[PDB]
Design an enzyme around this catalytic site. Structure first.
Site, mmCIF file in Angstrom:
data_model
loop_
_atom_site.group_PDB
_atom_site.id
_atom_site.type_symbol
_atom_site.label_atom_id
_atom_site.label_comp_id
_atom_site.label_asym_id
_atom_site.label_seq_id
_atom_site.Cartn_x
_atom_site.Cartn_y
_atom_site.Cartn_z
ATOM 1 N N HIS A 159 0.829 -1.217 0.000
ATOM 2 C CA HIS A 159 0.000 0.000 0.000
ATOM 3 C C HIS A 159 0.855 1.255 0.000
ATOM 4 O O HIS A 159 0.463 2.292 -0.543
ATOM 5 C CB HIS A 159 -0.928 0.018 1.222
ATOM 6 C CG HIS A 159 -1.831 -1.175 1.293
ATOM 7 N ND1 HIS A 159 -1.745 -2.118 2.295
ATOM 8 C CD2 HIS A 159 -2.821 -1.589 0.466
ATOM 9 C CE1 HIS A 159 -2.649 -3.061 2.085
ATOM 10 N NE2 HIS A 159 -3.317 -2.763 0.984
ATOM 11 N N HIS A 206 5.909 6.990 6.334
ATOM 12 C CA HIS A 206 5.608 6.558 4.986
ATOM 13 C C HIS A 206 5.037 7.751 4.244
ATOM 14 O O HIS A 206 4.852 8.827 4.822
ATOM 15 C CB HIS A 206 4.569 5.440 4.997
ATOM 16 C CG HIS A 206 3.270 5.850 5.609
ATOM 17 N ND1 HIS A 206 3.006 5.727 6.959
ATOM 18 C CD2 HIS A 206 2.170 6.413 5.059
ATOM 19 C CE1 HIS A 206 1.796 6.193 7.211
ATOM 20 N NE2 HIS A 206 1.263 6.608 6.073
ATOM 21 N N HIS A 212 2.230 9.077 0.865
ATOM 22 C CA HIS A 212 1.204 8.842 -0.143
ATOM 23 C C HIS A 212 1.539 9.758 -1.310
ATOM 24 O O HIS A 212 1.967 10.891 -1.093
ATOM 25 C CB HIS A 212 -0.167 9.205 0.412
ATOM 26 C CG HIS A 212 -0.495 8.490 1.682
ATOM 27 N ND1 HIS A 212 -1.262 7.342 1.712
ATOM 28 C CD2 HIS A 212 -0.119 8.732 2.961
ATOM 29 C CE1 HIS A 212 -1.360 6.921 2.965
ATOM 30 N NE2 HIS A 212 -0.665 7.737 3.735
ATOM 31 N N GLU A 232 -3.103 13.557 0.777
ATOM 32 C CA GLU A 232 -4.369 13.125 1.352
ATOM 33 C C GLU A 232 -5.109 14.342 1.910
ATOM 34 O O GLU A 232 -6.240 14.623 1.520
ATOM 35 C CB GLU A 232 -4.090 12.093 2.433
ATOM 36 C CG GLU A 232 -3.382 10.852 1.858
ATOM 37 C CD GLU A 232 -3.683 9.592 2.630
ATOM 38 O OE1 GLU A 232 -3.341 9.532 3.828
ATOM 39 O OE2 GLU A 232 -4.264 8.650 2.042
ATOM 40 N N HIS A 262 3.827 10.996 6.269
ATOM 41 C CA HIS A 262 3.202 10.746 7.562
ATOM 42 C C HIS A 262 4.209 10.123 8.489
ATOM 43 O O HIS A 262 4.689 9.010 8.232
ATOM 44 C CB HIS A 262 2.020 9.796 7.393
ATOM 45 C CG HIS A 262 0.861 10.435 6.708
ATOM 46 N ND1 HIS A 262 -0.151 9.714 6.112
ATOM 47 C CD2 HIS A 262 0.566 11.741 6.507
ATOM 48 C CE1 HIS A 262 -1.027 10.550 5.581
ATOM 49 N NE2 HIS A 262 -0.615 11.784 5.807
ATOM 50 N N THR A 322 -5.856 6.825 7.730
ATOM 51 C CA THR A 322 -6.413 7.097 6.403
ATOM 52 C C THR A 322 -6.479 5.866 5.505
ATOM 53 O O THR A 322 -6.830 5.977 4.328
ATOM 54 C CB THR A 322 -5.619 8.167 5.654
ATOM 55 O OG1 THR A 322 -4.320 7.650 5.349
ATOM 56 C CG2 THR A 322 -5.509 9.448 6.477
ATOM 57 N N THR A 323 -6.102 4.705 6.040
ATOM 58 C CA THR A 323 -6.347 3.441 5.358
ATOM 59 C C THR A 323 -7.059 2.517 6.319
ATOM 60 O O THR A 323 -7.017 2.717 7.537
ATOM 61 C CB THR A 323 -5.053 2.719 4.907
ATOM 62 O OG1 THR A 323 -4.431 2.101 6.032
ATOM 63 C CG2 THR A 323 -4.076 3.669 4.258
HETATM 64 N N1 LIG Z 1 -1.983 6.821 6.656
HETATM 65 S S1 LIG Z 1 -1.947 6.788 8.276
HETATM 66 O O1 LIG Z 1 -3.158 7.336 8.839
HETATM 67 O O2 LIG Z 1 -0.821 7.498 8.813
HETATM 68 C C1 LIG Z 1 -1.823 5.103 8.771
HETATM 69 C C2 LIG Z 1 -0.869 4.681 9.693
HETATM 70 C C3 LIG Z 1 -0.821 3.340 10.061
HETATM 71 C C4 LIG Z 1 -1.725 2.437 9.503
HETATM 72 N N2 LIG Z 1 -1.769 1.038 9.803
HETATM 73 C C5 LIG Z 1 -0.908 0.328 10.691
HETATM 74 O O3 LIG Z 1 -0.020 0.873 11.319
HETATM 75 C C6 LIG Z 1 -1.152 -1.136 10.848
HETATM 76 C C7 LIG Z 1 -2.075 -1.479 11.962
HETATM 77 C C8 LIG Z 1 -1.831 -2.347 13.021
HETATM 78 C C9 LIG Z 1 -2.865 -2.466 13.936
HETATM 79 C C10 LIG Z 1 -3.998 -1.712 13.660
HETATM 80 S S2 LIG Z 1 -3.656 -0.854 12.214
HETATM 81 C C11 LIG Z 1 -2.666 2.873 8.589
HETATM 82 C C12 LIG Z 1 -2.719 4.202 8.228
HETATM 83 ZN ZN LIG Z 2 -0.414 7.690 5.778
#
Ligand SMILES: NS(=O)(=O)c1ccc(NC(=O)Cc2cccs2)cc1
Ligand SMILES: [Zn+2]
Length: 257
Positions: free
Chosen positions: A61, A91, A93, A103, A116, A195-196
């Site tokens: 992703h 990471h 986007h 985003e 992020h 956001t995912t």
């Molecule tokens: N794009 S974002 O909001 O910063 C974000 C950060 C982390 C995750 N997901 C994870 O870290 C994996 C997970 C483990 C347990 C619940 S979610 C998804 C979106």
């Molecule tokens: Zn993110």
């Protein structure tokens, strides 16, 4: 499973993750004229001097640069936050074109990408517990525009060839995330979500006003990554962003006038 295609993209997520239509979803458009300056907001405290990066991973992703978060080594404090939040990963986007990819948007403006930096509240013990709490995470969001290269990003760009496909990882030690910050730490802040999927409503969003600039060559290298695993049909990892969601009953606060 979920993704960013026509058949599994953001418009579909609500079927597996009903919270997709919840009360505090992210990202959102930041209407700069409607955001309110909050003179009681404390300056952000970014303490990354002891950061210990470990690994970079293509998870299908995006790609995550992961950190040792078993001690207070790289932490975010202050701003709207109470307590200490540890950096666990960052990471990005990004888009297929320079005119899209972020985003969050600012007065409906889309940036080429968005960084992020993900942190979790140490009072909850571990990341998995933190995401179950309304104040569990703090994500520092930083916009990227295309212009001059960002020297501090180049190490990341240069390892991407080694993690082209889903499930690939590479050692990534001694990376300094301070090299990804803009000069100013002026920010907007609001309560939001991942956001995912699973879209959990556990994030205090802190989005910096000042974007960083990256070169066309740098973002082009992001776009050579793959969503797919090795030996599966090639699908370029581009446009891995969720569009702005309704603000609903929320006020975006600004740290600056
Ligand atoms: N794009 S974002 O909001 O910063 C974000 C950060 C982390 C995750 N997901 C994870 O870290 C994996 C997970 C483990 C347990 C619940 S979610 C998804 C979106
Ligand atoms: Zn993110």
């Amino acid at each position: 499973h979920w993704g960013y295609g026509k058949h599994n993209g953001p418009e579909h997520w609500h079927k597996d993750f009903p919270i997709a239509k919840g009360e505090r979803q992210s990202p959102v458009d930041i209407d700069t004229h409607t955001a309110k300056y909050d003179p009681s907001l404390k300056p952000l405290s970014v303490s990354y001097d002891q950061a210990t990066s470990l690994r970079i991973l293509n998870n299908g992703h995006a790609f995550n640069v992961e950190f040792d978060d078993s001690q207070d080594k790289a932490v975010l404090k202050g701003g709207p936050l109470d307590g200490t939040y540890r950096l666990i990963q960052f990471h990005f986007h990004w888009g297929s074109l320079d005119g899209q990819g972020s985003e969050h948007t600012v007065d409906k403006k889309k940036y080429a990408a968005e960084l992020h930096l993900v942190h979790w509240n140490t009072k909850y013990g571990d990341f998995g517990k933190a995401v179950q709490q309304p104040d569990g995470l703090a994500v520092l969001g930083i916009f990227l525009k295309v212009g001059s290269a960002k020297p501090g990003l180049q190490k990341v760009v240069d390892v991407l060839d080694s993690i082209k496909t889903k499930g690939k990882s590479a050692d990534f030690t001694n990376f300094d995330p301070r090299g990804l910050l803009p000069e100013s730490l002026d920010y907007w802040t609001y309560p939001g979500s991942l956001t995912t999927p699973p879209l959990l409503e556990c994030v205090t969003w802190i989005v910096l006003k000042e974007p960083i600039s990256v070169s066309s060559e740098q973002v082009l290298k992001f776009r050579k990554l793959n969503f797919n695993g090795e030996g599966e049909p090639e699908e370029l990892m581009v446009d891995n962003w969720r569009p702005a969601q309704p603000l609903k009953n929320r006020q975006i606060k600004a740290s600056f006038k």
